[PDB]
């Protein structure tokens, strides 16, 4: 198999990482597309790594030099599924320096501004596991919506600051379409939940910025909430800066 076919299976997850790192689907996808066009132009730039996946993420991180280095470290382990040694190789740091980078991250990521959030999830055990993780971080669950109709009603009554939404509901209907109705009147951070993340990581049409895989490591949820609030704060500061 050639480099194109060696790396092609790893592109969806690299977009997930890129979007979590930049805070938008447009910047996330564009940084992946740029690294991909750089590789096609000169195959020799591909780093020599332990695996094709590590080499792809290493090339991305070297081209990218965007959230800070401890946030990159935590994302690689908590969201991306790399062990500490693979992530240190991706970041081009010694295992010892990565451990300190991860501690600086763990402190930042574990300290989140208390937020009121709505959960759109029909599976009771999944709904409770998200609730328990969110509460452990100091957040407040305003309620759990199981359908699109309950979600719009819960959004109007409680006005949550953030939404954690499953892709498919009790009814065949889309959780994305349900969320898109809220996003019109008010722009709030949203973290999507799906059993099939690759379907939403093509970079070929409008897709989620933040994507949790179900079932999830609770650290994946913790990390993505932290990023969403990190960019929400930067966005709010910049939007009211001239006032
Ligand atoms: Ca203002």
Which helix (H) or strand (E) segment holds residue 27: the answer is helix 25-41
Going from the Cα of 162 to the center of ligand 1, the distance in angstroms, rounded, reads 20
Going from the Cα of 240 to the center of ligand 1, the distance in angstroms, rounded, reads 4
Going from the Cα of 27 to the center of ligand 1, the distance in angstroms, rounded, reads 26
Question: Does the bond joining 215 to the residue before it have cis omega, within 30 degrees of 0?
Answer: yes
In angstroms, the CA 200 to CA 83 distance is: 24
Helix (H, G, I), strand (E, B) or coil at 167: coil
Going from the Cα of 228 to the center of ligand 1, the distance in angstroms, rounded, reads 20
CATH of domain 1-113: 1.20.140.160
Going from the Cα of 138 to the center of ligand 1, the distance in angstroms, rounded, reads 26
Going from the Cα of 156 to the center of ligand 1, the distance in angstroms, rounded, reads 23
* CB distance 179 to 152 below 8 Å: no
Contact partners, residue 54, CB within 8 Å, separation at least 6: 82, 86, 89, 90
Query: For tokens 């990581």, what's the residue?
Result: 201
* CB distance 87 to 78 below 8 Å: no
The CATH 1.20.140.160 portion of the chain extends over 1-113
Going from the Cα of 232 to the center of ligand 1, the distance in angstroms, rounded, reads 15
In angstroms, the CA 212 to CA 196 distance is: 10
The CATH 3.40.50.2300 portion of the chain extends over 114-243
In units of Å, what resolution does this entry have? Answer: 2.0
Please give the CATH superfamily to which domain 114-243 belongs.
Answer: Response regulator (3.40.50.2300)
Going from the Cα of 143 to the center of ligand 1, the distance in angstroms, rounded, reads 29
> Residue 40 has which token pair?
């096609």
DSSP H helical ranges for 111-214: 124-136, 148-158, 175-185
Which helix (H) or strand (E) segment holds residue 64: the answer is helix 52-64
In angstroms, the CA 199 to CA 236 distance is: 30
Approach to solving: X-ray
Q: In this structure, what are the phi and psi dihedrals at residue 119, rounded to the nearest 5 degrees?
A: -105, 125
């Amino acid at each position: 198999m050639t480099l194109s076919t060696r790396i092609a299976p790893h592109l969806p997850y690299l977009r997930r990482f890129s979007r979590a790192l930049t805070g938008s689907q447009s910047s996330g996808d564009a940084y992946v597309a740029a690294a991909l066009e750089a590789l096609i132009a000169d195959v020799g730039i591909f780093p020599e790594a332990s695996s094709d996946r590590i080499g792809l993420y290493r090339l991305f991180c070297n081209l990218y030099k965007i959230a800070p280095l401890p946030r990159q470290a935590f994302l690689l382990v908590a969201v991306e599924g790399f062990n500490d040694h693979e992530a240190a190789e991706i970041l081009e740091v010694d295992q010892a320096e990565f451990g300190r980078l991860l501690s600086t991250a763990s402190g930042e990521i574990s300290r989140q501004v208390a937020t009121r959030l709505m959960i759109i999830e029909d599976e009771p055990l999944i709904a409770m596991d998200i609730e328990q993780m969110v509460e452990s971080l100091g957040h407040e669950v305003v309620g759990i919506a199981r359908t699109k109709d309950e979600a719009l009603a819960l959004y109007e009554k409680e006005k949550p600051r953030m939404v954690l939404a499953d892709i498919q509901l009790a009814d065949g209907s889309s959780g994305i379409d349900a969320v898109n109705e809220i996003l019109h009147d008010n722009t709030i951070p949203v973290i999507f939940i799906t059993a099939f993340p690759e379907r939403l990581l093509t970079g070929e049409r409008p897709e989620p910025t933040f994507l949790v895989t179900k079932p999830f490591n609770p650290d994946m949820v913790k990390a993505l909430i932290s990023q969403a609030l990190f960019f929400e704060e930067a966005s709010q500061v910049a939007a009211h800066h001239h006032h």
